[PDB]
Amino acid sequence: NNSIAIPTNFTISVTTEILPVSMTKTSVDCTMYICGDSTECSNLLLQYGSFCTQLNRALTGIAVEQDKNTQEVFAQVKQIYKTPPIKDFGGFNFSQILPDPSKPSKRSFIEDLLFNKVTLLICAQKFNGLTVLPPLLTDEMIAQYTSALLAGTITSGWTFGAGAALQIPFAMQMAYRFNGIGVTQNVLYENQKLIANQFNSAIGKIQDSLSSTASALGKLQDVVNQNAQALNTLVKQLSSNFGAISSVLNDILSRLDPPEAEVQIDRLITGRLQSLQTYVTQQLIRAAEIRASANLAATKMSECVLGQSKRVDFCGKGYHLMSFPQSAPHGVVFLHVTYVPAQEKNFTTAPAICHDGKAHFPREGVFVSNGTHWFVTQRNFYEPQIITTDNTFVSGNCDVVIGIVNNTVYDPLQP
């Protein structure tokens, strides 16, 4: 009831968060799938109603949604900013996440690790009535959005997300970001070199973590695998006869005349149509899964990247400072920079202080004593400061508060 732990140190932790944004866009034709280049089957399929229009309409609704999903996640700013050629950010080392023109692709280094770590007869399935529509935004252009977002973040911080971009030194941008955590600016400037080294080392460990065999991109790789097996299963169902004499329409039309081939051909259509109906229904549910993730990704960039978010454990573990978006295959990777408190120390604390028979409370901080003398200190850091009337506000008398302690408050103007 009278002990507190005030950290005397800190650690800048750069954790990574991975989120799917869009999945592969696919379109399926009934005629190619169910009644492949068959006049008799196609003429017998149109009497099953407007199922096929629903199939095509549903998939197109998904396909346009995937293009939309990338828009909210990435197309948050209509101004493409460019980082200045001079990399002078108070010792911060950004070269390994900003785009590097020394490669044919204008992606960045951490962005390239990601593309190589996701593995995409795949083309054979594309010729059986299945088509994969390319994304509206190509990888190079999505990488330009992230570069624009970064260039605004480093150069302008959160201002560019709330209107016109406002250039500000990165040393001051981080300085206020500490101020938003409740950490006074003097903490950063007094040890700016230390913070930069921790941040620079923190980014390096991300490269080593991804560069090794530890494949942490399970979510993005799962999206590719989930789509691949769904398509692979869908095409595989064409080999099942569903109780028919054969699983290929061409043979049936060759060995049987229409009047008695109607029974057999109808059997395949029902089975194939049902299997296709299963695929779209499963895809629609998955689209909701991605749409929820896409909205979460858009929300995170709006708050984590474009600003500083007070939401705990939303923009990284610990007191979140600011994030960096990185394009990844079928998703986005965030590099949350968080202010993690470090080594602590025992301290005896009292809720208030009684000097002239009146209780003194801390304006911003807590009263601590390291054994002999009482001090008022920051909550998230330890800089002891003398108790002064300008650093405390008086309210009431000393016989109401529990735990108050005698002590002398230095008057700043008496001497």
Binding site: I80, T131, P135, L137, T138, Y145, A148, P169, L238, V248
Partner: protein, 134 residues
């Protein structure tokens, strides 16, 4: 063995019965077709897109030789441009970049402007900016 099948039990290979030579079967070129319409209110000019299809086998898709003269436009004309999305007909490629009006795919967008024709272009991400950081 005389017939080779794929995962879908569709013959992707065969041997000629007359001569014992291995012969390959691949499905004929196919794909969906889309139409870019600026709007009946605006005009009636339309650009047709053959998705993921080479421009070299467009006219053979239909028997335009013995069809109405209106269908001969696909066997001639300079409005035939190839894109990653597929073969685009009825629009002209333009070096300039503008905001996206009708999304197409692979980063290109189509729009109608002014003599009068539909233009296919790479969408502009936005106004180029360079923050005066110091």
């Amino acid at each position: 063995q005389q017939f080779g099948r794929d995962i879908a039990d569709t013959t992707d290979a065969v041997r000629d019965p007359q001569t014992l030579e291995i012969l390959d079967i691949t499905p004929c070129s196919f794909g969906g077709v889309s139409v870019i319409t600026p709007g009946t209110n605006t005009s009636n000019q339309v650009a047709v897109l053959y998705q993921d299809v080479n421009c070299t086998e467009v006219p053979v898709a239909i028997h335009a030789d013995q069809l109405t003269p209106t269908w001969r436009v696909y066997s001639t004309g300079s409005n035939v441009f190839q894109t990653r999305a597929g073969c685009l007909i009825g629009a002209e490629h333009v070096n300039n970049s503008y905001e996206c009006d009708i999304p197409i795919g692979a980063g290109i967008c189509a729009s109608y402007q002014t003599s009068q024709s539909i233009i296919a272009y790479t969408m502009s991400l936005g106004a180029e900016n360079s923050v005066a950081y110091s």
